[PDB]
Structure formats: C-alpha cells, structure tokens
A paper describes a structure:
Examples include herpesviruses and most bacteriophages, both of which replicate their DNA as head-to-tail concatemers containing multiple copies of the genome that must be cleaved to generate unit-length viral genomes. This is achieved using a “terminase” complex, which, in bacteriophages comprises two proteins, termed Large (TerL) and Small (TerS) terminases; but in herpesviruses contains three separate components—pUL15, pUL28 and pUL33—in hitherto unknown oligomeric forms. The terminase complex recognizes a specific sequence or structure on the concatemeric DNA and cuts it to produce the free end where packaging is initiated. Acting as the packaging motor, the terminase complex then hydrolyzes ATP molecules to translocate negatively charged DNA into a space-limited procapsid through a dodecameric portal. Each subunit of the hexameric ring is a heterotrimer formed by three proteins (pUL15, pUL28 and pUL33) interdigitating with each other.
Here we reported the atomic structures of a herpesvirus hexameric terminase complex in both the apo and ADP•BeF3 bound states at 3.5 Å and 3.6 Å. To elucidate the structural mechanism of viral DNA packaging, we determined the cryoEM structures of the hexameric and dodecameric terminase assemblies in the apo state at 3.9 Å and 4.6 Å resolution, with C6 and D6 symmetry respectively; and those of the hexameric and dodecameric terminase bound with an ATP mimic, ADP•berylliumtrifluoride (ADP•BeF3, a nonhydrolyzable ATP analog to mimic ATP in physiological conditions) at 4.3 Å and 4.6 Å resolution, respectively. In our structures, six copies of the ATPase domain are arrayed around the interior of the ring, forming a “funnel” like structure with a central channel. Structural comparisons of our structures of the terminase assemblies in the absence and presence of ADP•BeF3 show obvious conformational changes at the ATPase active center and the basic patch. Upon binding the ATP mimic, the P-loop residues R261 and T265 rotate to contact the γ-phosphate mimic, whereas the adenine base is sandwiched between the aromatic rings of residues W266 and F171. Interestingly, residue R346 from an adjacent protein subunit inserts into the ATP binding pocket and interacts with the γ-phosphate, contributing the third positively charged residue (R261, R262 and R346) at the ATPase active center like other ASCE family members, which indicates that residue R346 might be a trans-acting arginine finger candidate. Consistent with our structural analysis, the R346A mutant did not alter its oligomeric assembly, but completely abrogated ATPase activity, demonstrating it as the bona fide arginine finger.
Author numbering:
A (entry chain C): 13 to 82, 96 to 129
B (entry chain A): 38 to 176, 197 to 291, 294 to 340, 348 to 432, 476 to 602, 614 to 685, 705 to 719, 723 to 727
C (entry chain B): 2 to 266, 306 to 403, 407 to 429, 485 to 650, 655 to 772
The structure:
C-alpha cells in the first residue's frame, strides 16, 4: 500500500517517462489513490477561504472570457452571445434603477 | 434503507481541516465539493435514494435498487473494490470518524421519526392503492392526470412542512425524490409549501375520483389532523364515498361517523383524525373547499377566518363548465395574483390554441408580442425631457394616412420616434380622424403632424439636429405629396427637415412619399424582436393631441399592437422605428 | 444486518474518488491563474497528481467502458467527465508550466493556460444520421447540448443504434470540455434565457393563471443548467486568517500582521451617460448607486493594497496572478464591463446589495415586494368578500399625463409592477452571481444513452441462446404471412378497445428520457409524450396528428410484405416520423386483433428500453413481441425465455421484418 509520492522523487523526468517507468508497468499493484495538495501558500494568504478562492476563480474566468472575444474570425458566435448578454444586462440594470427612481 | 448503514471508508486526504467538510455517506472532503452541484446533487441523491421505500421506485426500476441512480457494472465494481486510499492519519482518524458517524446518526434518527413514518405510510400507501386505480381492494393502471398530481403535491408538501418542521431540507429532498421530480429549483418546491391555492377543473375530468382517495389516505396515514370540507348543496356523495373506501381498505371498526357530519378514523392511540363537514354550516389544516363559484355570504366568513390560521391550506378545487368559464368568483382572481390559482384548460387564451394542449387532454374522455413585454412596455416609461443626453440627435416621423371620414379604419396614424441609448423610444402618437367633407384633408393631416412635432421639439429644446419625415403613399401618391408639401411649408416657421423620397417604378422623379411593400416584413420582424427584448419604450412625456379624451396613448397603441399575428398607428410606429437607404433634404 | 451489498461500498468509494478528483480539478483551475514562479514551486505536486490521475483512469477504464455499454448512470457519467477533464487539464497545465522557464514570460503563460489565443474550442458537430436523411447540427452552448439530447430522445424511433452512439460520443466529447470543469461554467457557453427540459416540467406543474405555458417560457431564466452557489466573502478576510496561517514562523507572522495594520492606515465617472430619469438635483437613486459602487471600489482597492503589502512582508515578492499581470487590460473597462466581471475582494452578492440598498429607500409597493404571499392572501380575501399656445398646451398636457401616469403606478398595475420588478431582480442576480454548473446535462445524457445502449444490448444479447429462427430470409414465408394478414384484415377494431390502443401507442412513440409513466405516481402516456413532444418545439399541425392518429380495410395494413420497418423510399425528419407512426400503429392494431381473434397466449407488446439491470449484470427480458426500432431486425418475439427470466439456453426467439410473420410464428410456437 506504498503511496505514489514516496515512490518517485527526483529531477524533471518528463511526465511520460514517469508513466512508463512507474505506473504503466504491468507488474505493479496500483494502490495509493491519495492525491496531493497543489494550492500554494502565496494563494492562501490573499484568498483564505474556499468562498473567496472560488470568487476570484470566477472573476478571472469572466475576465478571460472577455479578453478572447475583444485570424479574422470576426463572428465567433460565442462573441456575439457575450456582446448580446452585456448589452442586455446594461439596459436591464439601467431600467431597474430608473423604475425605482420613478416610483417615488 | 441501505445506504445509511455504510462503514467508515477510512479515505485519508491532504486538505487542511480549516477547509474540509463532511458530506453524508462519504468521508471528509474539501470544501469545493460542497459548492459544485455536479457532485453535491449526486452525493445527496444516492443517500436519500435509501429512505424512499421499495413501492415508490416506479413500475420498472430494477431488481432491488433504483437502477438509474445506483448501478455499477459487474466489471467496474470488481475494478473499484481493488482501490485503496492512504487510509489514515492516526492523530486525525478519530475526529473524522466521529463527524461522519454523527452526520449519519442524524440521518438514521430522521429515519425513525414517527412523523416521518406517517408520511411514508401516506406516500407509499398512495402509490400502492393507485396501482389498482383506487378500487375497493382491502390492501390497466390508474395513472394520475396532471392536476390530480399537483393537488397531491400541494397537500403533501404542506403536511410535510407542518408535521415535520425540524427536517425541512431532508424532507424536502425526500419528497423531491418520491415525486420523481429531482433537480427542481427550490423556488418551485417552496411554492408548493404555500396555502390557499385555487384549482379549476372542467367537469367529468376527475376531481372527486381523486379527492376521496386523497381524503381517505390523508386521514388514515397521518394522526390527529382534522380535515375540513365544505360545499353549497348538501357533500353527501363524497362523504358516503369516503366512508365506503375507508371501511373497504381499512377496518370498518376503525371508522366512526354520523351522516353528513364528522367522519373519524380510529387508531391504537386516541389520535382519531376527523373530516368534520362544514357544508351544512378550530384547527382544520386542509379545509377542502369543493366548490368556489357558487358561495352564499355568511358562509365565506368561516373561510376568511381560517385564513387567519397558520396551519390550514384552503384548497379551492372547484369545477368549471366552459359555458360559464369566466366564473364571477375566481376567474377574475387571475388579474391580481401571483402563483395562486392554476386553471386546467385545454382551449387556452385564444379561440383555438387547442392544438397546443391537444395531446394533453385526458384519454379517458374520448400573440406575437409577449404579454410580459407589453406589461413591461406600458409599466416602465423613461423620462426623455431629463435624460436628453441619452437620445440620438435625429427624430423619425412616419405618417400612415387614411383619406376618408366617418369610418373606423379612416384614422391617420402618426409616430415620432428616436434612438435612446441603443433602443427606440416613442415621443408622439396620433390617431387622427378627418372632419367629413373638409376641403383640405392633406393640410388637416399636415397640421396634425406639425402640431405633434412642435410639441416634441419644445419639450426637448436643442436636442435634435434633424427630423426625417416619411408619408406613406400607398393610398394616394398625390395626397401623400400634398401632406409632405404642407408639412414642409408649415415647418418653415435649428433642426433640418428632410423627407423620405421615392422614385416610383419607371420614373426618374423623386417624390416625398414612402411606398410600403417589400420592407414591411423585415420592419415587423425587427420590431417584434426588439419589442419583446425590452428595446422599445415610450417617453414618459409622450405627446398626443388625438388620443387625449378617452384613453392613454401608450395603452391605446398596445391594444393595436396586440393584434399582431384598424392598424394605422401600429404601422406608423413600426415603420418609424424601422427608419430610425439615405433620406434627404 | 451487518453486511451491506458490495455495490454500495463500491459506490461510496466512487463518491469519495469523485470528490477527490473534483478537489484536484479545483487546484488545477487555481494553478491556471497563479504566478508561474509559484507554479514552478508546485510542479512536483502537479506532476504527482497527473501521474495519479493517469494510473487512476486505467483501473477504471475497462470498468467505465463496460458501464457505458450497459445502463449509464449519473454517477458514472459525472465521474467519466471529471476524470477525463482532470487528465486533460493536468497534462495541459504541466506542459504550459514546463514551457515556462524556457521563455520566462508570464503574460505568455497566461495567454496560453487561460486560453486567450486558443481558436474557440467550444464548437462541435454531431451528424445525427437518422433514417430518411442525416440531419446535422452544431453544438456551441450548453442549452444547445440539452436541445440536441431532447431532439434525439424525440426522434429516437428512427435513428439507429450505432448512429446514436456515435452522436452521443461526439456530444460527450464536447461535454468533457464544457461540463468538464464542473465548477465555473465559463460565460462563453451559457444562455439562461433558454429554458431547459426541467423548466417546462416545473412550469406545467406549478400554478398557471391562464397564461398558456408557451407564454411563460419567454421570461424564465431557467436557473438549472447553471446554478448560482451563493458565494459570500467577509470584509476583513485575510486579517482573520493571517494569525493562524499554516507553516509561518511566529516572527514573520508578527511582522506581517504589523505591516498589515500599518498599510491599513470601477468607472463611476461613466454613470452620467446612463439614462437616469426623475429629478436631476437632489438625493436620487443613481447617485446612491454611485456612492455604493465607490464604497465597494474603496474596499476592494484597500484589500488589494493590504494584500500586496503583506505579500511583500511575508515572501518579499509581489506575486503576479491573472488579475495583476493583466491589470493593464483591466481597470480600463466600462461600468458594465466592470460590474459583470470584477470584485476579487467583494462578492457578486455585495454588488447586488450595493444596488438594492440604493434602490429601496424611504419609499404600498414595498409591502407587496417584501412578502408577495400576504399580497395574494389579501387578494383572495378581497375576492371572497366580493407656437406659444403649442408650447403652453404641451406643458399642460404633459403635466396632466405625468400625473395620471404616476397615479396609475401607485394605484393600479401593482401586479404587473411586482412581477416586472421581481423579474428584473432575477435577471440581475443570475448575471452577477457566480454560475457554477448544473445537474441537468449528465442526467439527460445518461437517460438517453441508457435507452439507446439498451436497444443495442438487446439486439446483441438475443443473438443466440437457443433457436434464432429468422423470418427476414424468406423461403416461403409469403405463404404464411399473406394468410395471417388476410385473417386479421377481416375483423373490426372493436372501439371498446381504443382506450387501450391509444395508450399502448403513446407508450411506444414516446422516448426513453421522459418516463412520466413509470414514476409510481405515473401519468398517462398522453402527458408523458406531451413533454417529449412540446419540449422539442413541434409544429402544431403535427401535435394533433399524435392525438388523433388512432381515431380511424386499410390504415392498419400499411406495411408491405418484407419491408415493415424500412424507410428506403422516404426522406426527411417529419415524413420519417410519420411512417414510423404508421408502422407502430400497424403493429399495435395487429397485436390487438391477434389477441381478439386467437386465444393462444399473451403478447403485451413490450419495448427493449425497459428492463433496467438488477444489482449486477442481470436483465431478465420477459416474454413477448418487442419493437426494437431496428430497421435490420425490427420484430423480435420471445415466445418463452426461462423460468428465471434471463435469455438462457431455453429462450427460443423469432426475428422477423414482417409483423404478420411474427404473429404467425408466435401462434406456431405457442
Ligand atoms: N386519469 C384518470 N385516472 C382515473 N380516473 C380517471 C382519469 N381520467 C378520467 N377518469 C374518470 O373520470 C371519472 C371522474 O369523474 P369525477 O371526478 O367524479 O367528475 P367531476 O369533476 O364532475 O366530479 C371517473 O370515472 C374516473 O375513472
Ligand atoms: F360533470 Be357533472 F358534475 F354532471
Ligand atoms: Mg357526479
Ligand atoms: Zn466561437
Ligand atoms: Zn433551466
């Protein structure tokens, strides 16, 4: 039941070499389904909560999904959807403010 | 109950305790696994799939499991049984085991609640009695119609929240499963929890065939809960039928009743739930109002008073006929209400949308612009006189003339529109009717449009650099030209005035009229799309001289628009907007 | 009561493994935005996890392969998607971090990982390949995958098995890229205005005050294929968590808290361009929204400065994540483009509250808004109880029409006002809040693949096990087929049976997705088919030809001699379905007449889409004549299978293309 992290510990050895030498071998038993912890410490001091980490992960996703749609594909129907959604949300928030301005 | 009795599954992990959470059935997982409904809604259903009894999995569900939720191939189970985790942290094994077994003990304690045993004895007994189509079996199928399932959901989701309050989330999920409607937004399931809901079933569709089994099984399963009931003409058939079925599929020694009055079902204890009948005129919790279109006063007072209670759900299941479909007592309620009454109709709003709900009809018994867009349109109007910076500097005016008098289709339509942000806004409307036998119909029409424009100009001074005017010439080219000429001259008393011009076929002349033909379908198509998405609105200070002595101009326009499938104003509005090839000076 | 069935422990192990894989794919979606100088530090952990996923989807690869071919389940589908996407992203992130340290460029690494230069990998083709023509669409969004799956369930009675499996593989290959993240659902593929299959099922069921259901599917945000997850984030977040950080020396932690305490000591300008009606001078709602947004900007900038300072104190390096390495492209966006995306120190709920604390202030209408239940209650109570002159006249009429408009907005239309305000608030919340994912796509994918793989598995499983007496190869089967046809074309339909044909017809024209007739709260096949037919928008001139397709010596002998389930002549999607309906009605009426003339045995006219597997690999196909929807071997009659039920050594079956040949071979064998 020896774990994979205390099995191989050395220099780069590009991933396929490790796959060939350690786990693709048929003589192995394939125990040790223990994953590892990949999130760093410099990313926990500033986002110290799964909620805050998820919010930041969503903010950067919403930004990337704007930078890619801003060689001449020029239609990229996802881009037209993302422009229609923004131009709809703008009008909707403006009318939501204006209506309650009028209700007084 | 099988998935509740599972051992620890040691299952070591690397995430710090400051993040990990305890999902039931499984060990301790990172907090992200509680935010993703992809895994949460699976680890939550494979567990509640054990509380659901074996008589509520379906007709064909598998041997001894809900095979469409818990099925592992005979090769994947043998390849999974050889998977082994880190299995431990000796200083950290005991707390995780304690937490997991504590959550599972909470679940098991939920399994043993008497009030939950009653809800099970209700839903299981109902799905079992329904197998025989509610015959007199002591205890080809009896499929429920749609509303005959909505009534059951309305009763069960209420009595669940009333009898079992300390288990809101768990019983909510259990009922979502048992009705075979999982992945339902909690807004709908919450709507099921409401009281005082109204039904409207057509006769001979089945309302008493389903009520008396509902009444009988809401009596015999639950304990100590009364059940109201009221009708105008003295309920005797339903009462005798309830007596019959209860004495049939339960011990007749248990039922005790006096004719036309309280029926009571016995129990080992002194629970003795009752069906006291209020037809002949405390805590009821059902108050099944069986007829709600024929009530006499001094009998509505008990119903208005029971609304003051917090445990009664007055169900207004009342029949309709379609000869009196617009009941003087309920069909008006659909005006000012929100998720209160649900009609059971097969010929919907229009004269013949029946082909839509045709397949929905019982087998035994054998609008271009959306309303929301119209309500939003009239409901919200932007103030143009104070948001002039949002407007484009061009006005577009379309005149759709009719050159007759003393006719209902003799109205001239005029619209003055512009761009507002990237949307379109109406500044003025006219529905103008020639005085009979005037000598100057074009000038009368011109004076009407000029007066409208002027008012719009005065309300927004300095806003507009251009006004572009189209006079439809389909009716008469000469008469359209005459209108343009009078508009031209009168406006000569700043913004530049430009007319749309048309070079008629075979001609080299550019006339100041507009010919409506090939551009109609694109114009209408674009309008419908824009209007429906909230992109066309009316100015809060919209101008109209001709619609100022009987109805609101926007309300009037909307009545014409709702004929899309006298149209002068609709055409002018749609075409003015379409206009907003180059028109010129 | 001690031993629990081994499948239950295997399912618990699979749930734990799915949770671990989800955690790993969350760490991955984190390291795709972290500084490469830190990705190089976490390189060994990422390599170890990639090795783990590789060695993991080889112990489950034959298992999941056998599973896909036998009754897929939401757990298995979700696990396959997560394992495949985790493998993909692990290999890609490792490659992109090892490409770094050769270029040493951060902006390049971010344009690579976050996919800023990729050529839109969210396009796919299907090529449904039905009979009578092969219709091909293009999956782009998520609701498009949902629509295609519903379309396949609808036209399930024409498409063959292998074509359906090919289309379903090319759909799962797109779901791996879209539903693979399972946590953030990038906005390039989401259109909440499109209601999914469950919005219709929960709009048929909830209240409908008139308002034909086709008129309600236009306002719904559908809230199911992309949920909201309601993330909440405190104000002084890191200061709460810095004293108890992991692996920090007490001296460093103390001086870091000191630097934090010391350092603690949007596009608002573009609001005036918005259409703001009402009074211009004074306390208005647009100025209140501007002040709320300015306060939120102050909070976020303060948090960012504090974070930079504390990182300079603890590690000494101002880390460059995807919001600090692309701050040039950021901080230049408009008001709306900063509202949609933004607030790494706030939450979308904080933006919602900053808007609503500005709208709802100091006011009838708010009472209806806060509690609509009491509003409908009072409604029910009330129901039960019951040039110069031009300018001056313009000012006067605009005055008397603003007054009337405000009078309407305060007195009447309150139903419409409440509904519109609620819908606007919903359209706001669905746009701002963090969409995570939904549980509709794997559910429907499993529900459709189950039916198709079940048809294929029955076609392959009844191959042998006994006599396979075939009637598609015709020695003289004409002689015994025309006789039975003439013997059944003689009697009347006996309309006292139509309430059974009209049900056993919709029980076959239906699809495997919408059960709604085996729920144990079963609804008739009428509604069970109305769901699967109205969801996939059908022409109303076809919806009546479903209901009225049995009300009527022909019309139950429309098949030729050998070509019963054969659409060689016709082409299209509507006429192919019409011929399918003709053939199915013919089979049903033939079975009913055969029962009403001959008393040999029962047929019960079953379908292979039923017979879900038991605890392990057992199917027990009961006796009867099946439909099988296969143009190569449509009718399969199991005259007698076994004492247990499964197709065993004594399970003689009869293949045939010819319905009456089956009805004669059943009689001969029974
Ligand atoms: N889906 C159904 N399930 C069971 N019975 C049904 C169904 N549809 C119609 N029926 C039949 O309709 C009748 C019910 O009529 P009933 O509810 O008494 O009419 P009313 O609404 O006028 O009181 C019964 O004969 C019942 O068998
Ligand atoms: F359909 Be009835 F109440 F005669
Ligand atoms: Mg009757
Ligand atoms: Zn694209
Ligand atoms: Zn939806």
């Amino acid at each position: 039941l020896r774990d994979t992290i205390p099995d191989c510990a050395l220099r780069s050895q590009t991933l396929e070499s490790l796959d060939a030498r350690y786990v693709s071998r048929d003589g192995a038993h394939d125990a040790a389904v223990w994953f590892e912890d990949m999130t760093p410490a410099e990313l926990e001091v500033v986002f110290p909560t799964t909620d805050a980490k998820l919010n930041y992960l969503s903010r950067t996703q919403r930004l990337a999904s704007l930078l890619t749609y801003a060689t001449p594909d020029t239609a990229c129907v996802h881009g037209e959807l993302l422009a229609r959604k923004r131009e709809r949300f703008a009008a909707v928030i403006n009318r939501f403010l204006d209506l309650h301005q009028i209700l007084r | 109950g099988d998935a509740l009795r599972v051992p620890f599954l040691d299952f070591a992990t690397a995430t710090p305790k400051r993040h990990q959470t305890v999902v039931p059935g499984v060990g301790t997982l990172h907090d992200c696994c509680e935010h993703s409904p992809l895994f949460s809604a699976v680890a939550r259903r494979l567990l509640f799939n054990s509380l659901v009894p074996a008589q509520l999995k379906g007709r064909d569900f598998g041997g001894d499991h809900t095979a469409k939720l818990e099925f592992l191939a005979p090769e994947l189970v043998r390849a999974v049984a050889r998977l082994r985790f880190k299995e431990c942290a000796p200083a950290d094994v005991v707390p995780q085991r304690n937490a997991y077994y504590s959550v599972l003990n909470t679940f098991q304690a939920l399994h043993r609640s008497e009030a939950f045993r009653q809800l099970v004895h209700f839903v299981r007994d109902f799905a079992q009695l329904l197998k025989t189509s509610f015959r007199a079996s002591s205890l080809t199928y009896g499929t429920l119609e749609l509303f005959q399932k909505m009534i059951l959901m309305h009763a069960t989701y209420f009595l669940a929240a009333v009898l079992l309050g300390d288990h809101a989330e768990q019983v909510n999920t259990f009922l979502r499963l048992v009705f075979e409607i999982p992945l339902f937004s909690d807004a709908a399931v919450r709507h099921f929890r409401q009281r005082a809901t109204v039904f409207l079933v057509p006769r001979r569709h089945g309302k008493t065939w389903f009520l008396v089994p509902l009444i009988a099984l809401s009596l015999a399963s639950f304990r100590g809960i009364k059940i109201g009931y009221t009708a105008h003409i003295r309920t005797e058939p339903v009462f005798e039928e309830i007596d019959a079925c209860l004495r049939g599929w339960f011990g007749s020694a248990r039922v005790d009743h006096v004719k036309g009055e309280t029926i009571s079902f016995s129990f080992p204890d002194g629970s003795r739930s009752t069906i006291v009948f209020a037809s002949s005129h405390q805590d009821f919790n059902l108050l099944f109002v069986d007829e709600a279109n024929f009530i006499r006063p001094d009998a509505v007072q008990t119903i208005m008073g029971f609304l003051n209670q917090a445990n009664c759900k007055i169900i207004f299941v009342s029949s309709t006929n379609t000869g009196k479909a617009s009941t003087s007592f309920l069909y008006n309620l659909r005006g000012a209400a929100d998720e209160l009454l649900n009609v059971v109709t097969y010929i919907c709003d229009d004269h013949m949308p029946r082909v839509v709900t045709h397949t929905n009809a019982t087998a035994c018994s054998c609008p271009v612009l959306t309303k929301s867009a119209g309500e939003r349109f009239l409901l919200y109007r932007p103030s143009t006189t104070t948001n002039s910076g949002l407007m484009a500097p061009d006005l577009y005016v379309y005149v759709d003339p009719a050159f007759t008098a003393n006719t209902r289709a003799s109205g001239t339509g005029v619209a003055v529109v512009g761009r507002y942000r990237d949307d379109y806004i109406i500044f003025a409307l006219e529905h103008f009717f020639l005085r009979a036998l005037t000598g100057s119909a074009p000038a009368d029409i011109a004076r009407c449009v000029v007066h409208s424009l002027t008012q719009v100009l005065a309300l927004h001074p300095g806003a507009f650099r251009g006004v572009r005017v189209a006079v439809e010439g389909n009716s008469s080219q000469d008469s359209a030209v005459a209108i343009a000429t009078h508009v031209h001259t009168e406006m000569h008393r700043g913004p530049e005035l430009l007319f749309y011009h048309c070079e008629p076929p075979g001609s080299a002349v550019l006339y100041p009229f507009f010919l409506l033909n090939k551009q109609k379908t694109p114009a209408f198509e674009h309008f419908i799309k824009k209007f429906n998405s909230g992109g066309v609105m009316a100015s809060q200070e919209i101008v109209s001289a001709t619609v100022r002595l009987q109805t609101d101009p926007v309300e009037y326009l909307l009545e014409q628009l709702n004929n899309l499938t006298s149209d002068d104003l609709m055409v002018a509005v749609i075409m003015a907007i379409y206009l907003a090839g180059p028109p010129h000076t | 009561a001690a031993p629990v069935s081994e499948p239950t422990v295997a399912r618990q192990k699979l749930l734990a493994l799915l949770g671990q894989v989800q955690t790993y794919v969350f760490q991955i979606e984190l390291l795709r935005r972290c500084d490469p100088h830190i990705g190089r530090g976490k390189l060994p952990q990422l390599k170890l996890n990639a090795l783990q996923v590789r060695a993991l989807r080889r112990r489950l690869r034959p298992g999941l392969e056998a599973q896909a071919g036998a009754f897929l389940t939401p757990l298995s589908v979700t696990l396959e998607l997560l394992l495949e996407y985790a493998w993909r992203e692990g290999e890609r992130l490792l490659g992109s971090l090892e490409t770094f340290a050769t270029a040493g460029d951060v902006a390049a690494f971010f344009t690579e990982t976050m996919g800023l230069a990729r050529p839109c990998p969210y396009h796919q083709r299907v090529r449904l390949d039905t009979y009578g023509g092969t219709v091909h669409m293009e999956l782009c969004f998520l609701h498009d995958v949902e629509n295609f799956l519903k379309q396949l369930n609808y036209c399930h009675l024409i498409t063959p098995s292998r074509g359906a499996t090919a289309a379903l593989e090319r759909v799962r290959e797109f779901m791996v890229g879209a539903v693979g993240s399972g946590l953030i659902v990038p906005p390039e593929l989401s259109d909440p205005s499109h209601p999914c299959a469950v919005c219709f099922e929960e709009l048929c069921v909830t209240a409908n005050q008139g308002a034909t259901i086709a008129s309600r599917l236009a306002d719904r945000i559908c809230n199911h294929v992309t949920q909201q997850a309601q993330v909440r984030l405190d104000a002084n977040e890191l200061r709460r968590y810095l004293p108890h950080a992991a692996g920090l020396s007490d001296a460093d932690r103390a001086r870091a808290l000191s630097v934090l305490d010391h350092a603690l000591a949007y596009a608002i300008s573009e609001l005036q361009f918005w259409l703001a009606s009402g009074d211009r001078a004074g306390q208005t709602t647009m100025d209140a929204f501007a002040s709320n947004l300015t306060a939120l900007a102050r909070r976020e900038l303060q948090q960012e400065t504090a974070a930079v300072a504390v990182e300079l104190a603890l590690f000494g390096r101002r880390a460059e994540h995807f919001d600090r390495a692309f701050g040039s492209h950021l901080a230049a966006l408009d008001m709306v483009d900063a509202l949609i995306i933004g607030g790494q120190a706030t939450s979308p709920d904080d933006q919602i509250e900053a808007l609503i604390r500005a709208c709802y202030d100091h006011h009838p209408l708010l009472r209806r808004l806060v509690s609509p239940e009491q509003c409908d209650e009072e409604a029910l109570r009330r129901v039960l109880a019951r040039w110069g002159d031009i300018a001056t006249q313009a000012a006067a009429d605009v005055r008397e029409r603003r007054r009337l408009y405000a009078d309407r907005l305060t007195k009447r239309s309150l139903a419409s006002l409440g509904r519109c305000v609620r819908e606007q608030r919903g359209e706001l919340e669905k746009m701002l809040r963090v969409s995570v994912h939904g549980e509709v796509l794997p559910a429907t994918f499993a529900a459709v693949a189950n039916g198709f793989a079940a048809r294929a598995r029955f076609c392959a499983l009844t191959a042998g096990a006994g006599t396979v007496i075939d009637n598609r190869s015709a020695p003289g089967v004409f002689d015994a087929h025309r006789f039975m046809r003439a013997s059944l074309l003689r009697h009347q339909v006996d309309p006292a049976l139509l309430p059974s044909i009209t049900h056993r017809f919709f029980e076959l024209v239906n699809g495997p997705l919408f059960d709604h007739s085996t729920h144990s709260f079963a609804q008739p096949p009428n509604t069970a088919l109305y769901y699967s037919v109205e969801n996939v928008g059908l022409l109303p001139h076809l919806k009546e030809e479903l209901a009225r397709f049995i009300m009527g010596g022909a019309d139950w002998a429309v098949s030729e001699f050998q070509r019963f389930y054969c659409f060689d002549g016709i082409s299209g999607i509507t006429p192919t379905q019409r011929a399918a309906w003709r053939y199915i009605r013919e089979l049903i009426i033939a079975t009913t007449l055969f029962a009403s003339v001959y008393r040999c045995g029962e047929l019960e006219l079953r379908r292979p889409d039923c017979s879900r597997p038991t605890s392990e690999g057992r199917y027990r196909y009961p006796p009867g004549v099946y439909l099988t929807y296969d143009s190569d071997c449509p009718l399969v009659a199991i005259v007698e299978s076994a004492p247990d039920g499964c197709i065993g050594p004594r399970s003689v079956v009869v293949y045939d293309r010819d319905v009456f040949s089956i009805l004669y071979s059943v009689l001969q064998h029974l």
